[PDB]
Design a protein around this ligand. Sequence first.
Ligand SMILES: *[C@@H](C)[C@H]1/C(=C/c2[nH]c(/C=C3N=C(/C=C4\NC(=O)C(CC)=C4C)C(C)=C\3CCC(=O)O)c(CCC(=O)O)c2C)NC(=O)[C@@H]1C
Ligand SMILES: *[C@@H](C)[C@H]1/C(=C/c2[nH]c(/C=C3N=C(/C=C4\NC(=O)C(CC)=C4C)C(C)=C\3CCC(=O)O)c(CCC(=O)O)c2C)NC(=O)[C@@H]1C
Ligand SMILES: *[C@H](C)[C@H]1/C(=C/c2[nH]c(/C=C3N=C(/C=C4\NC(=O)C(CC)=C4C)C(C)=C\3CCC(=O)O)c(CCC(=O)O)c2C)NC(=O)[C@@H]1C
Ligand SMILES: *[C@H](C)[C@H]1/C(=C/c2[nH]c(/C=C3N=C(/C=C4\NC(=O)C(CC)=C4C)C(C)=C\3CCC(=O)O)c(CCC(=O)O)c2C)NC(=O)[C@@H]1C
Ligand SMILES: *[C@H](C)[C@H]1/C(=C/c2[nH]c(/C=C3N=C(/C=C4\NC(=O)C(CC)=C4C)C(C)=C\3CCC(=O)O)c(CCC(=O)O)c2C)NC(=O)[C@@H]1C
Ligand SMILES: *[C@H](C)[C@H]1/C(=C/c2[nH]c(/C=C3N=C(/C=C4\NC(=O)C(CC)=C4C)C(C)=C\3CCC(=O)O)c(CCC(=O)O)c2C)NC(=O)[C@@H]1C
Ligand SMILES: *[C@H](C)[C@H]1/C(=C/c2[nH]c(/C=C3N=C(/C=C4\NC(=O)C(CC)=C4C)C(C)=C\3CCC(=O)O)c(CCC(=O)O)c2C)NC(=O)[C@@H]1C
Ligand SMILES: *[C@H](C)[C@H]1/C(=C/c2[nH]c(/C=C3N=C(/C=C4\NC(=O)C(CC)=C4C)C(C)=C\3CCC(=O)O)c(CCC(=O)O)c2C)NC(=O)[C@@H]1C
Ligand SMILES: *[C@H](C)[C@H]1/C(=C/c2[nH]c(/C=C3N=C(/C=C4\NC(=O)C(CC)=C4C)C(C)=C\3CCC(=O)O)c(CCC(=O)O)c2C)NC(=O)[C@@H]1C
Ligand SMILES: *[C@H](C)[C@H]1/C(=C/c2[nH]c(/C=C3N=C(/C=C4\NC(=O)C(CC)=C4C)C(C)=C\3CCC(=O)O)c(CCC(=O)O)c2C)NC(=O)[C@@H]1C
Ligand SMILES: *[C@H](C)[C@H]1/C(=C/c2[nH]c(/C=C3N=C(/C=C4\NC(=O)C(CC)=C4C)C(C)=C\3CCC(=O)O)c(CCC(=O)O)c2C)NC(=O)[C@@H]1C
Lengths: 67, 169, 49, 160, 160, 160, 298, 161, 161, 161
Amino acid sequence: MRMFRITACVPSQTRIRTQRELQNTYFTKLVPYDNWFREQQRIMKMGGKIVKVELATGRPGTNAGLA
Amino acid sequence: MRDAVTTLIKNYDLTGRYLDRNAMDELKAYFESGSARIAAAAMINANSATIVKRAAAQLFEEIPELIRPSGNAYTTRRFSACLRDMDYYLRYASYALIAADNNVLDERVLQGLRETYNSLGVPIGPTVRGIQIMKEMIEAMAEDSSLNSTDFIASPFDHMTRELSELSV
Amino acid sequence: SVKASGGSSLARPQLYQTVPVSAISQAEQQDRFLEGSELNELTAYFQSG
Amino acid sequence: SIVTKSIVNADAEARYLSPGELDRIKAFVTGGAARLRIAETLTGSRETIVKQAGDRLFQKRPDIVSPGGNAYGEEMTATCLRDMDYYLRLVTYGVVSGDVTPIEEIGLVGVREMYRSLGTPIEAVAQSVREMKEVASGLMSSDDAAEASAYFDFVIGKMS
Amino acid sequence: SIVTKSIVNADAEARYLSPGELDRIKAFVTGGAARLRIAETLTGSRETIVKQAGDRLFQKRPDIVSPGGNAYGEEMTATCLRDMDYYLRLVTYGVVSGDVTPIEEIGLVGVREMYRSLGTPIEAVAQSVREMKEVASGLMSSDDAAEASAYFDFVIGKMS
Amino acid sequence: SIVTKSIVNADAEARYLSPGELDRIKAFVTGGAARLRIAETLTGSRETIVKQAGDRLFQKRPDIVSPGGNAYGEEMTATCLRDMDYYLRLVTYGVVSGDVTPIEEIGLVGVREMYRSLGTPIEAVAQSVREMKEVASGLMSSDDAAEASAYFDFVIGKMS
Amino acid sequence: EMRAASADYFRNNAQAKEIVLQYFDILLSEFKAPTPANKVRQGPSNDIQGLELPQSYFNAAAKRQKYAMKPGLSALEKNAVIKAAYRQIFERDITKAYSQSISYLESQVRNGDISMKEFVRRLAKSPLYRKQFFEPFINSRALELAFRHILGRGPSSREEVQKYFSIVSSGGLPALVDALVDSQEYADYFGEETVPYLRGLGVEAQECRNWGMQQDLFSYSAPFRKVPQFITTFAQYDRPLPDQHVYGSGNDPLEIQFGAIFPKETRNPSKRPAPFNKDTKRILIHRGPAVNNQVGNP
Amino acid sequence: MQDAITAVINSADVQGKYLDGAAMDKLKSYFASGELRVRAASVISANAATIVKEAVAKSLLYSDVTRPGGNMYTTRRYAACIRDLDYYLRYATYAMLAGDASILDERVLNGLKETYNSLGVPISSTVQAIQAIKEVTASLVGADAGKEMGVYLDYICSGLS
Amino acid sequence: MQDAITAVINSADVQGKYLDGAAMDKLKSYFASGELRVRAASVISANAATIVKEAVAKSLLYSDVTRPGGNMYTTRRYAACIRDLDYYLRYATYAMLAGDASILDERVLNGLKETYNSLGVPISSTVQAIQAIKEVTASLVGADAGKEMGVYLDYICSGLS
Amino acid sequence: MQDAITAVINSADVQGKYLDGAAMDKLKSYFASGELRVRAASVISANAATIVKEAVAKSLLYSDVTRPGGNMYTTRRYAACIRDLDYYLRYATYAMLAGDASILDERVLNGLKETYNSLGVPISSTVQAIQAIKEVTASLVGADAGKEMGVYLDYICSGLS
Ligand SMILES: *[C@@H](C)[C@H]1/C(=C/c2[nH]c(/C=C3N=C(/C=C4\NC(=O)C(CC)=C4C)C(C)=C\3CCC(=O)O)c(CCC(=O)O)c2C)NC(=O)[C@@H]1C
Ligand SMILES: *[C@@H](C)[C@H]1/C(=C/c2[nH]c(/C=C3N=C(/C=C4\NC(=O)C(CC)=C4C)C(C)=C\3CCC(=O)O)c(CCC(=O)O)c2C)NC(=O)[C@@H]1C
Ligand SMILES: *[C@H](C)[C@H]1/C(=C/c2[nH]c(/C=C3N=C(/C=C4\NC(=O)C(CC)=C4C)C(C)=C\3CCC(=O)O)c(CCC(=O)O)c2C)NC(=O)[C@@H]1C
Ligand SMILES: *[C@H](C)[C@H]1/C(=C/c2[nH]c(/C=C3N=C(/C=C4\NC(=O)C(CC)=C4C)C(C)=C\3CCC(=O)O)c(CCC(=O)O)c2C)NC(=O)[C@@H]1C
Ligand SMILES: *[C@H](C)[C@H]1/C(=C/c2[nH]c(/C=C3N=C(/C=C4\NC(=O)C(CC)=C4C)C(C)=C\3CCC(=O)O)c(CCC(=O)O)c2C)NC(=O)[C@@H]1C
Ligand SMILES: *[C@H](C)[C@H]1/C(=C/c2[nH]c(/C=C3N=C(/C=C4\NC(=O)C(CC)=C4C)C(C)=C\3CCC(=O)O)c(CCC(=O)O)c2C)NC(=O)[C@@H]1C
Ligand SMILES: *[C@H](C)[C@H]1/C(=C/c2[nH]c(/C=C3N=C(/C=C4\NC(=O)C(CC)=C4C)C(C)=C\3CCC(=O)O)c(CCC(=O)O)c2C)NC(=O)[C@@H]1C
Ligand SMILES: *[C@H](C)[C@H]1/C(=C/c2[nH]c(/C=C3N=C(/C=C4\NC(=O)C(CC)=C4C)C(C)=C\3CCC(=O)O)c(CCC(=O)O)c2C)NC(=O)[C@@H]1C
Ligand SMILES: *[C@H](C)[C@H]1/C(=C/c2[nH]c(/C=C3N=C(/C=C4\NC(=O)C(CC)=C4C)C(C)=C\3CCC(=O)O)c(CCC(=O)O)c2C)NC(=O)[C@@H]1C
Ligand SMILES: *[C@H](C)[C@H]1/C(=C/c2[nH]c(/C=C3N=C(/C=C4\NC(=O)C(CC)=C4C)C(C)=C\3CCC(=O)O)c(CCC(=O)O)c2C)NC(=O)[C@@H]1C
Ligand SMILES: *[C@H](C)[C@H]1/C(=C/c2[nH]c(/C=C3N=C(/C=C4\NC(=O)C(CC)=C4C)C(C)=C\3CCC(=O)O)c(CCC(=O)O)c2C)NC(=O)[C@@H]1C
């Protein structure tokens, strides 16, 4: 299954108001290609910046055998 | 939630009717009241925290035991929680005044109030007493202010009283 | 009033924390027997009791 | 309702209504008079609006009414006109409420699935609503025609 | 370790160390002298303890040393004694740390599958740890041996 | 079975079974006669298989029936034979179903924890299953022996 | 003055009086401290209401232990984090009680290839969870359980239940899992490295609309009430009083020829309490002619 | 329902076995404790109304429950609360005599939580009332009979919760 | 949950007074029993698996429960019953150290009846197993510590009943 | 993470050797300093707000970052900065109680440097704030605890650098 290796930082927007424990907003992730669009859109809407992304698993332009 | 316009629309759509003369009349009444609704909401927003603080400072004198031992606001923690509930009541009453309908009141306030308060052991009578105290303060302040129309303000608080109040009779 | 009800069940918020409550809570939350650290807490607190 | 949207947005942040939301509410209240005027004209003209839109649609798209089309037959044509009447009523609801929430809630959720089940061309339905838009906009001033065009275009977009 | 567990709990709860945690840390520091004396005695008597445990284990479970078992000749017996010495050293580390954390970190997790792969009976190794426990308890004073037994039986139960 | 597994996957994806699953189900259904026949073979030979496997296992491993062994004693030995019969029955169930899911759900989930609480050596249990597989292969033809040994080795590997 | 009086009066030993000194210092520091800002739980969307809670309530409610899978965590705390994740996603320690686990995903989470969010996403759609909390349940009940397993809470609104039922209808269990994980609320409350936790009464502000619902959901008996307690009550709020005995749904016997067959309050929980006041006559369908009903034909 | 004797008999019957040594031992234990239970039952039956009175007085008098607006404000509501307390006292006494808690589940707990949730009855308040009932009954009944009575009252409270 | 300390403090506070004459007596008794209870808890934690093993051997093993058709038949069901016994022992230890079964009420008894009634777990067999666990723990820890744990274990048994 | 005891145990275990004289006296030193570390940690926890307030006052108040244009200007940015400093103080206290600096790398130095680089956070001002925290904590705890705390504070500042 083709998957993306993404490096992104997503600083919180409601930590001050909610008073919750901090988490490292910078992370490297192996995200499925199916969920990658939703994950990237959520990251952009959250306000964080994705610094690096790549297709870790899979061959570019593959027509069959995605799964 | 549904305001007056949306509840009228839903009511007419139930029968599958076009908006008739009575619908236009009710809409006109709400739209003309909207100025006073916005005015009252602005005033309550201006004096919100003071209103709740004064309402508590009257309610704990009406029923003094809520701050003495075995009372439900005994700690500062309990006191702050009680004032938070009072602030919630005021904010949702303001929302209901602007919306001209108590369904926004019901969906977000009353639908489980007795269950939650019984589970926490909170009294269900002193809370409505404080609600009425807030309503009295709000309407007195509105009457003092230059609010031509103020009758609608008693509707949300009185609906809260009727819903969350035990059926004595 | 309301035309339904979720159902009222008793809630038990903790008013404040004591050492025994803290240790028991940690062990119960982690699904463990009281280990050496919690046992030392309990013993020292009982001695100073 | 715009009032509904503003109150919900304020409640989501758990604060009292912001001055911007209050300004939006006041503007909506002020424009309520024009809203009632547009809605009243639409409801008064509902018969002629539906009839002229149906005539234009059945001239532009004879396939839907020709044999083999979904609306073919007297009963099917009457049902198509009834759907047009439903959507005109929804447009009046949206006009009164100042937004498209009633239109979405009543007649724009799962409409694609419903009309696929019924075998109807959703593009044809959108064309019918578009013609209703043109006919209704012919019956009012420039400002009110553009005002109702918003609801008509929203229905068109949701149907296509 | 007790301090490791305290730090872990503090991080999980998002706060500093309470009075109870500080008191237990202080008590652990005070008992560190006794636990270090325990470790000193164990490290002094390690060789005799391991030798007696090995011979008692061979007497009790001849199948390990007999044909068909893991103990053949001298090299297999040497490997078994090396594993026994490793377990004794891990018990000493647990005693010095006042907590089973060092024992688990060095070896307690995956021991079951490791011995399953090696063919060494986990019940037999747990038994051998047992006889190490009784030999150490006999070597040292009864009351002082309770703390060492508190970790020996832990390892035995984990391997049981 | 394969039918249950495919239906579960289709339900989880909220869809009908694909033809690539339907044809597999058809092939499984068609090739059921051989599985059934192996089933009657094993069930007919259950007593002899259990007896021979237990005899071979006890000959290979004397500590099990030796003093201090898990199966030491009359009732203990009878219970070990009962466990062997249990696993033979589960293997027959799996053979008939053409899948290992019945075995895994019935007598394979938590087996490690159960036998650890009982004190029984799971490796010895796996050895008993291996002896049972050898006896079954001896009593079965070359193809049938391999097919049954598939389930037998699955059980053995899951045990250890 | 109180502190000085206590110190002078007692003055026994530092081991006996340093405690008094420390506690009076804590008292003075807390008194000097300004009032803390109240925690605010924003409404996740338009459907749910925002909430607030004093930051004194969130100081005594036995705060949850939060586990974050940092990349460098040693084996012991990494194992603890994995066990916490297993307990959160399965209501218990399935790996410890049955040796059921996925070492394949465990290794990836341990080295950091897939962080906590993707671990949860894969685990929830794994067959292990699909056989325990989706396969044995209706779609509605499975969705309600999936909220607490993934979102640390229950359904908050009729609209939320409606949307997620539509999602699970379209894409099934994987679609529901994706919609839960790739949501603003999840990333807000847990980010990418925090295992989800149950935000109970003391963890945050609890809306007074799903009180009994979430109280019943959080308890370990949740997977045994098979009847959806969320959609039913959310519909019943908008609808009027139901056809039901005054004292509860369990108080209506079956209408069979004989036998007092009652729904047992503890077996397969199906209690449906309703606010019945005194003067609430019931509607009963007359066996004979409808005109013969004594309500209208006394 | 079922007493301890009934429980032993039912277990032996369901296993299809005669009363073995362990069943005899349990029966002997119940017979040993029987005189205590009879004494406690007689005491509580003699003082049924009083214990309820001081339970309410220590628990519910001059409180938000008895104020206007509470669930125990009106005279009819006070009578209903008293009837609830008398049921709980009577059935706890029955369970104490029988040595078993099956009766409470059969009669009281089988629908009582749903009943209070439909009624709006404050279960926290009723738990407090029964908890006070614990000590009020214990004072009259002694220490060990008090322990048994507290066991059954805790049973009622846990069922309510 | 609550322990003896917070129960005493809550009672004193609700009465509005300090810890005058009996709250401190109960607290000092609690502290006196605390170290022995901690030792008992340590022993129980060390021998947890052994205790469950002996209890299962005494009561459940070689019975219709373990035989086919019984609720403890399959391997998963056996493991679940073992884990339940471990839960019983651990929460009994928590209750013993706390001095109040409030932890048992809120974390164990809250839905224990519902879960066993829904699944089909034999209540009688479970109570027999818990009695065996209590007997084994009493044998392994002493008569005094045995009773101290047995009060809470029997509380769990009564709640199950 | 690890501590002094854990680190010495690991050092012995890597060569597979028992605790020698060096490990023995290092453990002696750790146990001797345990009381000092506990006292310093208790004082820091009691006065946690004070160190943050004083370090902020003497480090970044009336500065360019507080001026508009820097990362310290806005109220939300100021709150985030003070919360970050408070977590830094808490983890420094954790490290000082542990006796080992692995905790800061475990939880703090994992990605804070690169994430501040991503967000444009002033690293030099962060180091200055950490240093001011060093003097504040040294003054509050004493030279003996002050140097011990400043060791981990310098560790954090170097990791940020
Ligand atoms: C040879 C088989 C090994 C062996 C066996 C042995 N088993 C027991 C006791 C039990 N075994 C089981 C196992 C199961 N029951 C099931 O239903 C399933 C799935 C079908 C399994 C795996 C159980 C439940 C018991 C408990 C006894 C009972 O039936 O009630 C014993 C006796 C243990 C004791 O001390 O009583 C023995 C000896 N022993 C060996 O050494 C062989 C490796
Ligand atoms: C011996 C113990 C008896 C027995 C046990 C048995 N229990 C289950 C299943 C469950 N038991 C519980 C109970 C609890 N879980 C908790 O977390 C708590 C408090 C810590 C309690 C009291 C639960 C929740 C379950 C189901 C979910 C789970 O897996 O834990 C079973 C399984 C029955 C089945 O067929 O599924 C069994 C067998 N069975 C007996 O016969 C003994 C009398
Ligand atoms: C104060 C000394 C400096 C400063 C602070 C500052 N920080 C942020 C944003 C974040 N800081 C953190 C903190 C942590 N991340 C971790 O991994 C750890 C340990 C787990 C900690 C303590 C995080 C997570 C963020 C992102 C937002 C969030 O709260 O999750 C900001 C905000 C920057 C922005 O404009 O968005 C600021 C201002 N700023 C300075 O100028 C000081 C030098
Ligand atoms: C002023 C010199 C003294 C004083 C007077 C005062 N108090 C109140 C009101 C309240 N005081 C409390 C007290 C407490 N809450 C707690 O949790 C604790 C336990 C440590 C205490 C001592 C509370 C709950 C209230 C609110 C209810 C009430 O009206 O009493 C007032 C009235 C304020 C007003 O009218 O708004 C006054 C004048 N309090 C002190 O601490 C000083 C000794
Ligand atoms: C004050 C007038 C009375 C009072 C209040 C009191 N309330 C609580 C606790 C809660 N109150 C609520 C209520 C609501 N939550 C909502 O979302 C809504 C609508 C927006 C309402 C009305 C809830 C849910 C709780 C518990 C959860 C929470 O607060 O987040 C307390 C706490 C009691 C205690 O001991 O903890 C108190 C004291 N008490 C009085 O005496 C007044 C009559
Ligand atoms: C064995 C031949 C060599 C060896 C092994 C060894 N590996 C680790 C740790 C890890 N190994 C992996 C690798 C994988 N995990 C996967 O899921 C897959 C793909 C499906 C692979 C290839 C990972 C991820 C780790 C990290 C820890 C984890 O549990 O995942 C160790 C221990 C490392 C440690 O720091 O503790 C060891 C010892 N060691 C040798 O000497 C052999 C050459
Ligand atoms: C169609 C033949 C009849 C009909 C249907 C109808 N259903 C709903 C709403 C829901 N239906 C369900 C059903 C299920 N959920 C499950 O999990 C299962 C099995 C997997 C079933 C069968 C649910 C849960 C809902 C709620 C949907 C939601 O989002 O709330 C409606 C709409 C009801 C409403 O809008 O309030 C309708 C119309 N209605 C008829 O008249 C037909 C006879
Ligand atoms: C016999 C083939 C099986 C069987 C029977 C069995 N039934 C009961 C108890 C009851 N049976 C009924 C059934 C009905 N009530 C009706 O109104 C009708 C509709 C025509 C039917 C079929 C009821 C209500 C009961 C309750 C008890 C009563 O008689 O009132 C029992 C005994 C239950 C008990 O514990 O008392 C039994 C044994 N049992 C088997 O094993 C057979 C497979
Ligand atoms: C007429 C407008 C619609 C209609 C009516 C219809 N009703 C029935 C049967 C019953 N109607 C009721 C209703 C009530 N009983 C009450 O006490 C009250 C509240 C005070 C109401 C609203 C009841 C209970 C019945 C059942 C018989 C009984 O009265 O006891 C029928 C007959 C159904 C049958 O199969 O016999 C009909 C036809 N039918 C329509 O099409 C109209 C829309
Ligand atoms: C006075 C004419 C007689 C009398 C009075 C008396 N009453 C009580 C106690 C209570 N009285 C009531 C009655 C009511 N509460 C209500 O809400 C209603 C309707 C509005 C009624 C009728 C109640 C509930 C109590 C309990 C206390 C409380 O409510 O908090 C007492 C004291 C009893 C005691 O021991 O505490 C007394 C003395 N006594 C006489 O002799 C007169 C004949
Ligand atoms: C005046 C109404 C009150 C007052 C003033 C006062 N302020 C400070 C210190 C600071 N005030 C600010 C201001 C802001 N921070 C923000 O984020 C924003 C919003 C965008 C503003 C307006 C800041 C940044 C500081 C600290 C840094 C600095 O000085 O620039 C003090 C100093 C107190 C001290 O002890 O040094 C004071 C006195 N004092 C009052 O009494 C009034 C209520």
